[PDB]
């Protein structure tokens, strides 16, 4: 039984992340992993979209702890952002790990795309 201070960013953000973790579990996505994203989109009836790709960054600001992902579709260069705490995703699967010496793979956009096909 304690009254609360003006530190409500951390407790709204903390209980938001704890509620979204209570809904679905999420293992942590470090930068450089090769992961899958299973997305729920209505009216398509397939209800499990395929998003393979390589995480480029993690702009973690509490409930927007996000994923900058990249996969070469047969045309070119698709770069999708994912909020990890959104109710629209279903599960994540850390398939591989590049073991890259960088926190921000923005060089890898405009490189040779044989090193970017998931």
């Amino acid at each position: 039984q304690r009254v609360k201070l003006g530190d409500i960013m951390g407790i709204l953000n903390k209980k938001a992340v704890h509620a979204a973790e209570e809904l679905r579990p999420v293992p942590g996505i470090r930068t450089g992993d090769i992961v899958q994203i299973r997305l729920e989109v209505p009216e398509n009836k397939r209800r499990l979209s395929v998003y393979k790709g390589i995480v480029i960054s993690r702009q973690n600001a509490g409930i927007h702890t996000t994923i900058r992902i990249r996969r070469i579709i047969a045309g070119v260069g698709v770069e999708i952002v994912f909020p990890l705490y959104s109710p629209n995703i279903k599960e994540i699967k850390v398939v591989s790990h590049r073991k890259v010496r960088k926190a921000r793979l923005y060089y890898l956009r405009d490189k040779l795309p044989r090193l970017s096909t998931f």
Binding site: G6, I8, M9, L12, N13, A16, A20, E40, G62, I63, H64, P83, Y85, S86, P87, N88
Partner: peptide, 23 residues
Amino acid sequence: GTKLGMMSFFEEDGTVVPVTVIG
């Protein structure tokens, strides 16, 4: 009331809305 930062409310429909927090 006083402003206490900004964040994003996740609606259960799936949308992401930018909200201001009032104390």
